[PDB]
């Protein structure tokens, strides 16, 4: 019966969700719990480099608020 | 097809090479219940044709692969030795079951499908419609099936029934001789032709008076059709040639013998 | 009587309605969609596949399969070496020798069937006057060597002893048609 | 991919049926006709049966 | 961590490819009133692994007339490019974030034809040369319109960035305003993947096996792995461009689940199409693209230049 | 025996299973016997559910099914395509003609059994064998492949 | 760095499969096996002889049409211009002349393959 | 030991046997994979008289019926003797592969044979194989040969191409027998 | 035969036919595999008189 | 049996796991079906051998055998006839 096609489909379906989900989680793990920063233009890269320089630990994603001034 | 192989196997014991039709009639009578099962198959088959027509007949891809492919004129088809659908696809009104009938073909009603363009698409349409006309003949055969014996009551040709063979002296002698020497055929020669599914199927059979044929020349319809492949393939691509081989409907058991 | 398969050439004028219907058919692939509908409808049909070898294709008592040599209910061989089967065999697949048995009986000393010459036509079993040689119902006897398909008398009698229960019942079901 | 000439070479299934039939009785020759157009078996039988 | 992320893309995609070979054979089977594989594993789920192990245990061909460097290179290039097409795909976040990701796809996909061209030529046999020259014709047919179709769509996106397509479709599928381009795009991806009814470079009824006819064993498997990976890729691309999966910044996995479902469905229609139609003639594919798609594609490109100006709907640069 | 012999034996099973489970015959058929081969692929028997898939290229085929009569004119071509199958390869002789010449055994033009031209693994009798009889022979080839001991024999050399 | 890393892994994976496929299986090289395939009969000539191209004119037309799309692919940046009327006229004229070029070749039978 | 339990045994002593599946012509042809062909003393101190495989089998099968063969030792050699240098050069001429010979001492050569001998599959070469390549065939004297068993020895020049054509590239596949210059022969 | 009413509607709509009335799979409509014995008739030459072979 | 299944699937056999000393847990084939059940399972009749047993004959095999090809039990052909020509045997005693 047609529903016997589904075991292969479910395996396909699981395999096609892992890349999207794994990339989203690995980004947050490696970017301080936030989305990985996107630098489309030079201005955005400049902000990341400034964030890295003021972080104290050479990581752009470690943010400094008003407690730092 | 697998269901029709069962009708073959039920009358003869073999799905394909039945050896069931013999000179004098048929080998055995139909088993009880076979006509009903042939009727059950027959009443659903036209829907199976409709589904296939739904896939191909109006499909623009199918029409692009068969329309104006392998066009053959009526005059060339006659001079090239074509027969069957290879003539009727070009409009020639010819079919041996109607023009030179054999067995009980003059007692059944059916129509001969005729092409208009002489190309692969018209020949495909002719063959689809021929299947529909076959169902029409089958229905008449089912209703008009008469009673009686199934081989000629002439024990110098047709073997006697096994019960007679085991009771009567004449039947045993005739059984013995028919399965050893065989029946003698008076000397002569005939060219006999039928409207086989692939075209005119012919035999030129020479008897010298004995129980073995002196000469048997077999006329295969596909032998002339394949000989016309070069003619039909002019100005066509390799993929068209694949279609034109299919449109001739060719089996090499009959072309090569 | 004849009919035209592709003569629908009663050329007519075209309205806006029919021209648009023709336009929609070309531009929106409607007949191609009908094709997908047909294959979709088969997707949800029960497949015709049987679970071979746990299930089998239907057969009939007339089925022509592996040959066997039969006996009378006493155990006496039915074959009396008449050679009608050998004479009729269209493949010359049968080879027979015979002599008077120790009790004076007319019996074979050789009865060979080359199963790789045989065409499984059943002419031998029609020709046999005593229902000795038959094609049985077995069709699952493929081998790993050519030599295993050159059956001698011992093999053919063992097939008879192996398959008689089914062979007898198939003959009881068909012999009135013979 | 334009086809300039088709030269069909056959005989790759030529088995000498017609010669073999000369050594057969008429009944013995019948099964050779099943194996000609082996898609239309019974029609081949019918042609040979009518001729005989 | 970036190396772990490469694994969690490549390995699941290669398993998805392997099981698409199973799904194809079962979907085709059931549309043909058969079952397809149901013995090798439960419901046939080990059949792909058996075929893979069989092929790599088989003797690989070393034909005498063959020019061996290109013969080996072509299947190697095929799988490399198929896997590379996945790295910029945002599901919703890509492994590699590219500014011109769409142009990366076209260039990478366009290099993929050379695996067919070189394998067919390098094999140095007539049926393989026929398959290579059909690939030349195939690319000429569809590549003429594929980039213009994409161009018109991306005048509503405003960039070549794949991630921007997610935001463009925040409130509506791009299918709705672009369905005529979506239709032409869908036919183009069938031809681009050499799939039926345009499976011409292999076309087994005509060329036996076309470009890969001289290939055996594991080298043959690479072409097959590359073809099934590309089918998933092109449909996933169609999903992101026209069928914008639902995106929520706090629920990224919702995008991934929705993306997979639509991508699975679009891959199924590829197998459904194969079961339904006859093959085009390869001159007829050229006429389909150049005499039907190309006129409409050019008109619609002009229309999609015109639209944002007269509706004041130019998308943002950033 | 030893644990190295046990491991070798389990590997034989694994590689044997893979070749059993993915037998790809050549698209290759000679006469009426090929029609019954089509019926084995047809829905009732559906050979593809056992993992059996026709491929037209000898380079991509594992099994040759000699399905019909082998003439002298055809014999070199059949030998050629057999030689062009990569190994491991198997031959199934199907039907009386291929098995030993059958109805045409005594012809001037016919090879009396394809096993004069190629080695044969399975002989399937019948004229033609039914689709089911052919399927039985294919399953007998699988069990033959299941018995291959190539790695065990290599280990003991 | 990341794009270089993944593409090298892609290259690395493909080459490893090739090495496995060529060194794992048992081999048996002989001349008849390695001769070119042609349906069981020998080829009558080299596959390296000229193979006529019937669509050669479409092929070189494709070269020009491929530079036309190269002129169109800056359009996403061009629609950001203040000079909207100028951009629109340039894009409209560019598409129209390309259409006229296709229309001319179509009516000259330049899209028909040679026989 | 064989004659001690079967004193009437026929003993067949072939030289190196060439043929389609040999480990002689195929072996040297496969030196192309290592670019340069080592030979002890450059192959000028080794004489070979190789014999065709179908000649040996024909002689072996004739010895099953020959009344005069029992209890004897036969030497099955080919018609011609060659120095190992010219034989290998001819092999590379027939394969149309670049022939680059260079001398290699036997003790270094044996060590390479031991390394290749470590293969757990079928070794490409062994130490024993290296030793046997550089032992000269013994000059014919006294023992009967193939002619005594009704076999005319086939020259290597008549049959080598059937063995060596598969070792050519596509450029040279169709090159005929006569394009290769035959090897120079010796009488010692 | 065992399709649900929902699937029957789906496949009837998709095909454009009434598939349930003409199923390609066979159920109980076919003949029984055991039948009563036949009794076949004899031909016109089964006569005890006026049946000399030379007249036929 | 299940007569609600379509013709072809309405009857089936579950093979034993051991027959004649052979392990048939995985290695099953159609030749394991004995003749009395072969008729029923192939639908040559509607009557199973439980309620319609076959006739008993003393020479019928009591133990069915499956296909024994490529085993020590395989059939090996041979001529079943005896020597036809008889040689002269020379005398054992000498002659002078
Ligand atoms: C896109 C994918 C969407 C998924 C849709 C889910 C469909 C659920 C389903 O199969 O019901 C079909 C159900 C039965 O199908 P049918 O074609 O109408 O009738 C065939 C027989 O009645 C069928 O009945 P039967 O005679 O065969 O017996 C009852 C039936 C009961 O079995 C089922 O109905 C299948 C349930 C799964 O079959 C069984 O007993 C076999 C049980 C083992 C199931 C093996 C199938 C593969 C398992 C798939 C699991 C998923 C993968 C996990 C990894 O039809 C519906 O009602 C569908 C309505 C839509 C529901 C959604
Ligand atoms: C890499 C992918 C490999 C994944 C597949 C492995 C399992 C395959 C076997 C299978 O699933 O079928 C069971 C099969 C199924 O039985 P079957 O295949 O023989 O019978 C099928 C026919 N019917 C349907 C009638 C039953 O079980 C067997 O009897 C065969 C044994 C095969 C064992 C495979 C190897 C075992 C694992 C060894 C690993 C290496 C050892 C290292 C030390
Ligand atoms: C996506 C898939 C890609 C990966 C594919 C990988 C698939 C393979 C899966 C693993 C199985 C690998 C088995 C080898 C493959 C078969 C090749 C082959 O058949 O060659 C036969 C050859 C034939 O050998 P032969 O010597 O008999 O042949 C001689 C010449 N002829 C052929 C003429 C007879 O055998 C081998 O060489 C076997 C070598 C491998 C041995 C197995 C590993 C050693 C294990 C030792 C045990 C260690 C125990 C330690 C603990 C205690
Ligand atoms: C290049 C190495 C690629 C390794 C890919 C994985 C395959 C591993 C199994 C084959 C190992 C082949 C090998 O190197 O054998 C030693 C080689 C012999 O290679 P081979 O010719 O025997 O390779 C075939 C391997 N079997 C026998 C399993 C089929 O011997 C040498 O030492 C030459 C150096
Ligand atoms: C306000 C402004 C509005 C402006 C927009 C108006 C847009 C109108 C809509 C037009 C959409 C048309 C898309 C282009 C496809 C097309 O129409 O081309 C038809 C093409 C050729 O058709 P053919 O029968 O061969 O005749 C040739 C002359 N037409 O035939 C084809 O292309 C068919 C190719 C299909 C091949 C099979 C592939 C699978 C198909 C199933 C897909 C399922 C998803
Ligand atoms: C991409 C989709 C392109 C646009 C789809 C709309 C086409 C359509 O409406 O289908 C019509 C078709 C009926 O066919 P027809 O008789 O030719 O219609 C007469 C119209 N004057 O309708 C039908 O055939 C009935 C539906 C059967 C097919 C069901 C599956 C739908 C396939 C579409 C999904 C493609 C993937
Ligand atoms: C075997 C052959 C395999 C070839 C695979 C072909 C792949 C398609 C062609 C790839 C060329 C286009 C690459 C590209 O455009 O990436 C640019 C990328 C920077 O991306 P960008 O969006 O500009 O962002 C920077 C500002 N934030 O730039 C980078 O991040 C790094 C520098 C880009 C160069 C990478 C080139 C691909 C790797 C080639 C490896 C060697 C192959 C041999
Ligand atoms: C592979 C795995 C197999 C697919 C798994 C998903 C299968 C889900 C099956 C359940 C679908 C239920 C849809 C309702 C069907 C019954 C129904 O009510 O018919 C709806 C409609 C026809 O309605 P009706 O009134 O009967 O006909 C006359 C109307 N003018 O008919 C319709 O238009 C409904 C169309 C339903 C389409 C979804 C089912 C097809 C899914 C496979 C997609 C293609 C795969 C490749
Ligand atoms: C510094 C130089 C070092 C010394 C170099 C010595 C090189 C000698 C290489 C010998 C050949 C090894 O190469 C390998 O040989 C085997 C068997 O020998 C052959 O391999 C294959 O073909 C033959 C054909 O009959 C089969 O017998 C064999 O079983 C199969 O594996 C190939 O020819 C090659 O795969
Ligand atoms: C032979 C080739 C022929 C094909 C080429 C034909 C090109 C001709 C194009 C005619 C259409 C020009 O359409 C023209 O669009 C511009 C903007 O783009 C409109 O311009 C309008 O909006 C712009 C902003 O964009 C305002 O700054 C301007 O004041 C206002 O007029 C014009 O009102 C309209 O007339
Ligand atoms: S079945 Fe036909 S071919 Fe076979 S032995 Fe009987 S008569 Fe001869
Ligand atoms: S089997 Fe029958 S026909 Fe043949 S020799 Fe014996 S009794 Fe006569
Ligand atoms: S064995 Fe019989 S069915 Fe098969 S090819 Fe020969 S004649 Fe035809």
């Amino acid at each position: 019966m047609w529903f016997e096609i589904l075991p292969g489909l479910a395996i396909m379906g699981v395999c096609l969700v892992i890349p999207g989900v794994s990339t989203a989680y690995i980004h947050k793990f490696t970017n301080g719990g936030k989305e990985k920063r996107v630098a489309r233009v030079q201005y955005q890269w400049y902000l990341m480099e400034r964030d890295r320089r003021i972080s104290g630990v050479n990581r752009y994603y470690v943010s400094k608020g008003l407690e730092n001034i | 097809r697998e269901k029709m192989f069962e009708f073959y196997e039920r009358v003869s014991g073999a799905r394909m090479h039945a050896a069931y039709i013999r000179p004098g009639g048929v080998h055995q009578d139909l088993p009880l219940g076979l006509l009903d099962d042939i009727y059950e198959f027959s009443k659903n088959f036209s829907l199976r044709i409709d589904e296939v027509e739904e896939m191909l007949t109006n499909n623009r891809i199918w029409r692009n692969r068969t329309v104006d492919i392998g066009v053959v004129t009526a005059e060339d088809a006659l001079n090239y030795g074509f027969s069957g659908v290879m003539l009727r696809g070009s409009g020639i009104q010819w079919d041996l079951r109607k023009t030179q009938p054999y067995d009980v073909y003059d007692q059944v009603e059916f129509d001969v499908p005729i092409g208009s363009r002489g190309d692969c698409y018209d020949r495909y349409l002719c063959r689809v419609e021929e299947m529909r006309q076959s169902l029409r003949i089958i229905e008449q055969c089912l209703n008009k099936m008469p009673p009686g014996e199934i081989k000629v009551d002439d024990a110098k040709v047709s073997p006697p029934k096994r019960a007679e063979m085991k009771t009567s002296m004449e039947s045993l002698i005739h059984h013995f001789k028919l399965y050893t020497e065989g029946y003698q055929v008076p000397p002569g020669a005939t060219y006999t032709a039928i409207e086989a599914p692939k075209g005119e199927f012919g035999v030129y059979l020479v008897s010298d008076g004995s129980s073995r044929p002196y000469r048997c020349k077999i006329k295969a319809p596909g032998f002339a059709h394949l000989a016309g492949l070069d003619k039909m393939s002019k100005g066509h691509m390799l993929a068209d040639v694949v279609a034109i081989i299919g449109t001739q409907d060719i089996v090499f058991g009959e072309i090569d013998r | 009587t004849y009919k035209y398969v592709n003569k629908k050439e009663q050329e007519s004028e075209v309205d806006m309605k029919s021209a648009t219907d023709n336009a929609a058919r070309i531009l929106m692939w409607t007949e191609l969609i009908r094709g997908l509908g047909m294959t979709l409808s088969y997707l949800f049909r029960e497949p015709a596949t049987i679970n071979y070898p746990f299930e089998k294709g239907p057969l009939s008592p007339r089925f022509r399969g592996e040959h066997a040599l039969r006996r009378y209910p006493s155990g006496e061989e039915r074959c009396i070496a008449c050679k009608l089967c050998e004479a009729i065999c269209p493949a010359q697949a049968i080879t027979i020798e015979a002599e008077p048995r120790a009790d004076g009986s007319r019996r074979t000393t050789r009865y060979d069937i080359d199963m790789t010459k045989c065409i499984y036509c059943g002419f031998c079993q029609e020709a046999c006057p005593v229902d000795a040689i038959v094609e049985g119902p077995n069709f699952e006897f493929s081998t790993e060597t050519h030599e295993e398909l050159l059956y001698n008398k011992e093999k053919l009698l063992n097939n008879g002893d192996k398959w008689e229960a089914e062979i007898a019942a198939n003959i009881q079901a068909d012999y009135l048609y013979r | 991919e334009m086809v300039r000439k088709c030269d069909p070479h056959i005989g790759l299934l030529h088995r000498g049926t017609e010669k073999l039939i000369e050594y057969k009785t008429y009944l013995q020759a019948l099964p050779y006709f099943d194996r000609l157009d082996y898609v239309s078996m019974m029609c081949n039988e019918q042609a040979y049966s009518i001729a005989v | 961590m970036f190396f772990i992320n490469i694994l969690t893309l490549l390995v699941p995609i290669l398993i998805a490819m392997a099981f698409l070979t199973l799904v194809e054979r079962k979907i085709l089977g059931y549309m043909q009133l058969r079952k397809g594989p149901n013995i090798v594993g439960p419901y046939g789920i080990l059949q792909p692994f058996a075929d893979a192990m069989k092929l790599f245990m088989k003797e690989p061909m070393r034909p005498l007339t063959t020019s061996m460097s290109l013969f080996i290179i072509a299947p190697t290039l095929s799988l490399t490019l198929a896997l590379s097409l996945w790295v910029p795909l945002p599901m919703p976040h890509p492994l590699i974030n590219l500014n011109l990701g769409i142009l990366f796809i076209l260039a990478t996909s366009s290099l993929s034809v050379y695996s067919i061209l070189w394998s067919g030529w390098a094999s140095n046999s007539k049926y393989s040369l026929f398959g290579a020259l059909r690939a030349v014709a195939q690319t000429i047919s569809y590549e003429v319109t594929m980039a213009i179709i994409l161009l018109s769509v991306l005048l509503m996106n405003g960039s070549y960035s794949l991630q921007t397509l997610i935001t463009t479709q925040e409130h509506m599928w791009l299918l709705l305003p672009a369905w005529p381009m979506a239709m032409m795009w869908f036919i183009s991806t069938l031809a681009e993947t050499n799939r039926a009814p345009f499976d011409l470079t292999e076309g087994e009824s005509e060329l036996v096996s076309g470009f890969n006819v001289e290939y055996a064993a594991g080298p043959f498997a690479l072409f097959f792995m590359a073809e099934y990976t590309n089918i998933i890729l092109m449909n996933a691309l169609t999903t992101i461009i026209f069928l914008g999966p639902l995106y929520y910044i706090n629920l990224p996995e919702l995008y991934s689940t929705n993306f997979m479902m639509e991508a699975l469905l679009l891959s199924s229609t590829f197998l459904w199409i194969r079961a339904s139609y006859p093959r085009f003639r390869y001159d007829q594919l050229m006429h389909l693209l150049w005499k039907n798609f190309l006129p409409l594609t050019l008109a619609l490109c002009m229309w999609h230049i015109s639209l944002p100006i007269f509706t004041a709907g130019v998308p943002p640069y950033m | 025996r030893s644990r190295a012999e046990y491991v070798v034996t389990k590997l034989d099973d694994l590689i044997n299973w893979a070749r059993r489970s993915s037998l790809w015959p050549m698209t290759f058929g000679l006469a009426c016997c090929a029609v019954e081969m089509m019926h084995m692929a047809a829905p009732r028997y559906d050979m593809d559910r056992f993992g059996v898939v026709f491929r037209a290229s000898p380079r991509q085929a594992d099994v040759m099914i000699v399905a019909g009569t082998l003439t002298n004119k055809m014999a070199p071509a059949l030998r050629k395509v057999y030689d062009q199958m990569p190994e491991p390869r198997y031959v199934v002789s199907m039907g009386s003609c291929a098995n030993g010449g059958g109805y045409y055994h005594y012809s001037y033009s016919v090879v009396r059994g394809c096993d004069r031209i190629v080695p044969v693994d399975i002989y399937v009798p019948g004229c033609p064998p039914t689709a089911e009889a052919l399927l039985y022979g294919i399953l007998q080839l699988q069990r033959k492949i299941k018995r291959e001991q190539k790695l065990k024999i290599w280990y003991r050399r | 760095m990341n794009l270089y890393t993944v593409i090298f892994i892609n290259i690395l994976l493909s080459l490893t499969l090739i090495l496995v496929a060529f060194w794992l299986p048992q081999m048996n090289l002989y001349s008849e096996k390695a001769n070119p395939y042609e349906c069981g009969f020998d080829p009558t000539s080299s596959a390296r002889l000229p193979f006529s191209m019937k669509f050669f004119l479409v092929a070189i037309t494709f070269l020009l049409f491929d530079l036309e799309i190269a002129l169109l692919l800056p359009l996403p940046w061009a629609i950001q211009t203040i000079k909207t009327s100028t951009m629109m006229i340039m894009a409209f004229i560019l598409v129209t002349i390309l259409s006229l070029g296709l229309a001319y070749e179509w009516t000259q039978k330049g899209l028909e393959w040679t026989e | 030991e064989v004659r001690s339990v079967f004193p009437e045994a026929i003993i067949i002593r072939p030289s190196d046997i060439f043929g389609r599946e040999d480990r002689f012509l195929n072996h040297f042809a496969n030196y192309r994979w290592f670019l340069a062909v080592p030979l002890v003393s450059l192959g000028f101190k080794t004489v070979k008289q190789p014999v065709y495989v179908a000649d040996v089998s024909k002689g072996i099968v004739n010895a099953t019926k020959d009344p005069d063969a029992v209890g004897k030792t036969f030497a099955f050699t080919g018609p011609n003797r060659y120095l190992l240098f010219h034989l290998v050069k001819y092999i590379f001429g027939m394969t149309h592969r670049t022939f680059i010979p260079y001398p290699l001492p036997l003790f270094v050569y044996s060590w390479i044979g031991k390394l290749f001998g470590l293969s757990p599959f079928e070794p490409w070469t062994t130490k024993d194989k290296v030793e046997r390549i550089h032992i000269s065939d013994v000059m014919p004297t006294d023992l009967p040969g193939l002619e005594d068993l009704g076999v005319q020895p086939t020259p290597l020049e008549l049959k080598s191409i059937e063995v060596l054509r598969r070792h050519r590239t596509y450029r040279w596949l169709s090159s005929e027998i006569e394009e290769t210059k035959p090897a120079k022969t010796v009488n010692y | 035969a065992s399709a649900t009413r929902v699937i029957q509607k789906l496949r009837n709509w998709a095909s454009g036919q009434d598939l349930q009335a003409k199923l390609q799979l066979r159920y109980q409509e076919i003949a029984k595999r055991t039948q009563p014995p036949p009794k076949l008739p004899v031909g016109p030459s089964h006569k005890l008189s006026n049946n000399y072979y030379c007249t036929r | 049996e299940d007569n609600k299944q379509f013709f072809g699937r309405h009857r089936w056999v579950i093979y034993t796991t051991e027959m004649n000393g052979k392990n048939t847990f995985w290695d099953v084939d159609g030749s394991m079906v004995p003749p009395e059940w072969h008729r029923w399972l192939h639908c040559m009749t509607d009557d199973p051998p439980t309620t319609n047993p076959p006739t008993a004959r003393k020479f019928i095999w009591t133990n069915h055998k499956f296909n024994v090809s490529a085993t020590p039990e395989q059939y090996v052909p041979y001529s079943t006839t005896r020597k036809k020509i008889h040689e002269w045997v020379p005398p054992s005693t000498p002659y002078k």
Side-chain angles (χ1 to χ4, degrees), chain F residues 36-93:
Chain F
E36 282 277 27
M37 197 165 50
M38 293 172 150
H39 277 254
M40 185 191 61
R44 177 167 305 177
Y45 293 108
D46 178 35
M47 72 192 216
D48 161 278
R49 85 185 187 81
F50 304 83
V52 185
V53 195
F54 290 125
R55 294 196 60 89
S57 180
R59 276 73 161 81
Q60 292 146 26
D62 316 304
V63 196
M64 178 182 282
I65 298 157
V66 186
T69 330
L70 177 56
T71 66
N72 296 331
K73 196 176 202 169
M74 185 64 225
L78 180 143
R79 182 70 214 198
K80 171 77 75 51
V81 295
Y82 168 80
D83 276 327
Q84 286 176 310
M85 312 183 44
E87 289 173 59
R89 61 198 174 190
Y90 311 98
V91 172
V92 171
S93 174

Side-chain angles (χ1 to χ4, degrees), chain I residues 18-34:
Chain I
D18 177 20
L19 303 172
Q20 215 67 17
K22 297 188 181 172
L23 293 178
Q24 52 225 303
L25 301 179
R26 288 166 293 157
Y27 290 93
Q28 302 282 63
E29 67 275 4
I30 54 167
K32 304 296 182 276
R33 311 302 292 185
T34 167

Side-chain angles (χ1 to χ4, degrees), chain B residues 9 11-13 17-18 22 27-29 32 51 54 60 110-112 114 122 129 162 166 175, chain C residues 1-3 5-6 25-26 31 34 42 45 60 62-64 123 126-128 131 174 177-178:
Chain B
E9 187 274 339
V11 300
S12 82
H17 296 332
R22 320 196 169 178
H27 178 52
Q28 289 179 268
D29 201 356
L32 295 171
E51 300 172 324
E54 188 66 71
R60 73 186 71 187
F110 65 102
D111 299 322
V112 177
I114 295 302
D122 272 22
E129 188 54 46
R162 291 186 65 76
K166 287 190 213 194
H175 170 101
Chain C
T1 48
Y2 73 99
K3 53 194 286 179
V5 304
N6 196 45
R25 183 250 313 165
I26 284 160
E31 101 290 13
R34 289 176 75 149
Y42 265 88
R45 286 178 221 198
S60 83
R62 299 191 189 181
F63 178 72
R64 322 204 291 257
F123 282 15
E126 304 159 30
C128 186
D131 307 4
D174 206 64
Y177 299 97
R178 321 174 160 179

